[model samples]
Target: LGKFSQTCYNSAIQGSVLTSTCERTNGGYNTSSIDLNSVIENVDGSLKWQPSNFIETCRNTQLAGSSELAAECKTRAQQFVSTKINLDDHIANIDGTLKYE
Candidate 1:
């Protein structure tokens, strides 16, 4: 089990997608325009993320009959962390007595 768990984590890291998005239009049109100078300085950021409505329609078509699959997908959601770990503080809370065998 320990070996299998390590392999699983390695595979997850190799296959992970760090970012994603979804969108749609509800019988309507949405439009917006922003001046680059007002919102962002070219020196600070290079890319702008646009809210895509079409992707929602595409997802509706792709997963129309698989509601269960969609629900199960929450387990696979991405997690972002931005800090250093404190292993010393957390190690003592481990369930070391639990026998995996």
Candidate 2:
């Protein structure tokens, strides 16, 4: 278990995506988007993370077959993306040397 945990952490470093997303690591406030399928596949390749209870729970809850809900989720997600982009641009324009740390 310890080996697997370490391996997972190592994978995150190798992947680089985790560092960018994690704020405590001095990555940033603006999260980098990640593909769910890609993450699943990445872990699945090394360990059987896919089809596990945790993954199955995610499958059951995520977008669970309601078009209306799905539409709303998409719209809200887009709004978040747009807002973040606009905010980042504005901040950059104001002070380019701004760092979260």
Candidate 3:
């Protein structure tokens, strides 16, 4: 965990900017590192594990919000709503019921 934290911290610092940024260069969104996941202590002094695809979470959030994928999702959502039913309703129902159960 020390190594993980140190590496991410260094990467974030290297990626940081001191001044304001625009679309092409924004530092507000940048940081020394993000808490993509971690472990924690339980009330009884036990440990809990949490995990995620750190890179993918960041990339997908960036891409989905700023790039073609975001546009596509928005356009598809609009089109779907125009049809008076969400296209992914079935998937949502299934996912919500099974995966989250």
lDDT by candidate, in order shown: 0.30, 0.33, 0.32
Give candidate 3's TM-score.
0.18
Kindly list the per-residue Cα lDDT of model 2 for residues 17-52, writing each as its tens digit: 443332333543433434345335555457433454
Q: lDDT: which is higher, 2 or 3?
A: 2
- 31, model 3: CA deviation in Å? 1.2
Residue by residue across 1-101, what tens digits does model 1's lDDT show? 12333212222222222221212234433332224333333444654443334333222222224221121111124333222323343344347552322
Which tens-of-lDDT digit does each residue in 1-101 have in candidate 3? Answer: 34343223324322322222222233333343334224433446754554344333322222332222221222323331111223343433464573321
As a TM-score, model 2 comes out at: 0.17
Candidate 2 residue spans exceeding 4 A from truth: 1-21, 41-48, 51-101
Ranking by TM-score: 3, 2, 1
- Considering every candidate listed, which one attains the maximal TM-score? 3
